[model samples]
Target: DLSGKMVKQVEILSDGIVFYEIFRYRLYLISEMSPVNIQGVDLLEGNWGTVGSVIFFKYTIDGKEKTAKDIVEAIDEETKSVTFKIVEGDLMELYKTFIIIVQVDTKGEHNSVTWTFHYEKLKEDVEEPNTLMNFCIEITKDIETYHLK
Candidate 1:
């Protein structure tokens, strides 16, 4: 059920996880996800939650240290989905910002995970990375194998 735009592959060294997203631009991770937690029933929605809340992550870049700030933009409970926008910081000089959307669809026992990314190239010389795709596909296999185990 992973029907969407094929972005590329990714291999995150820190976690040693390979990932791939359909769309190269947007990728979403479940910072805090719970099965019993309904869409709008968690700490991230409504007056109890702040959509514009900023999240800071420190990641390495070019043998140097860097931190990126992201903002939660949208959320939908019924479908169990969320979107985030990169407000500040960049991993490289060429790319400054990007958008990520993640959705989980479950129908009975059938389910699928999807990620979408949207970005603007800084220059012609800058090429998008493919390690994310590798990371995602590896994760996909993990999820499937775990279910059978």
Candidate 2:
């Protein structure tokens, strides 16, 4: 049994309300939005931007295109957090379970965003998801840059 977790936080200098709005409407924004490293995203099933919906993200890494589908597990406004469970994806092949939790804490012009990953690898020889964690960090920066502009 192999399990691991990663947590990261990024500061967003934009107004707190800006980040709140983006998170409130994340599903809609995320569908049309592409991170600095991601190529595109598409909603494959369920309601457009509601809980329980499924979405797929397309990205090119090292000149190879890959896609992953995830289910919206939970979205809480009070906690300013949203979670996704990777139910169908390449990661599932290597990880027994993968969950992504994103949270935001707003404070004037210094809002902070957190990305946490809880994963269980299939075998002890599997490597940690450091690159994927970095990818999430870049996405956070991309979102912050977009709203700050």
Candidate 3:
């Protein structure tokens, strides 16, 4: 019943929709945007960012290598958000379920991003993934730096 109880919102200085479009249309290039964290993004089924498509990503966090797969659960154009539900990955070992929801907002001419860590741990020993969240935030900053250049 607990989904995304751990939530973090970020205030971004870049264009809002422009950031949203990346995950929606050009996520295959996200690895290029943040090579340090995300090494690759592969579209397993459907077009670039269509719903039902499975996105496989090879990534690194805290200097450890890992991989994950997620379904493009939904693309809410009206709200400027993209939903990704973990289907398979190293994370499955520690998390019963994981959902990544990113929303970009135009807050009175200021762009912001919100991240929802909708997941339940496999066991109480498995700690909250603040490291993973921080890595994702770093990815956001990488994208912002790319466009700002």
Candidate 3: 10-residue stretch with minimal lDDT: 1-10
Q: Candidate 1 vs candidate 2: which has greater TM-score?
A: 2
What is the lDDT for 118 in model 2?
96
Q: Compared with the true structure, what per-residue lDDT tens digits does model 1 show for residues 3-91?
A: 12344322222211112221112222321121111111122223322456555544433345555566668766556555667666663
- Against the true structure, whose TM-score is highest? 3
The residue-by-residue lDDT of candidate 2 on 1-149, one tens digit each, is: 59899999888765555555665454446434444367666677786546788888777555566778988788887768778889877788789999998888875556888889999999999989888888777666666667444
Task: Record all residue pairs in model 3 with backbone atoms less than 3 Å apart, i.e. clashing.
Answer: 4-118
Best by lDDT: 3
Worst 10 residues of 2 by lDDT: 27-36
- Give the Cα lDDT of each candidate: 0.44, 0.74, 0.86
TM-score of 2: 0.84
Error of 3 at 71 (Å): 0.2
Tens-digit lDDT track of model 3 for 26-114: 98667988998999998888887688888889999889899999998998888888999998999999898999899989756788999
Off by over 4 Å in 2: 20-36, 147-149
Query: How large is the C-alpha RMSD of every model relative to the true structure?
Result: 10.3, 2.4, 1.7
Q: What global local distance difference test value does model 3 have?
A: 0.86
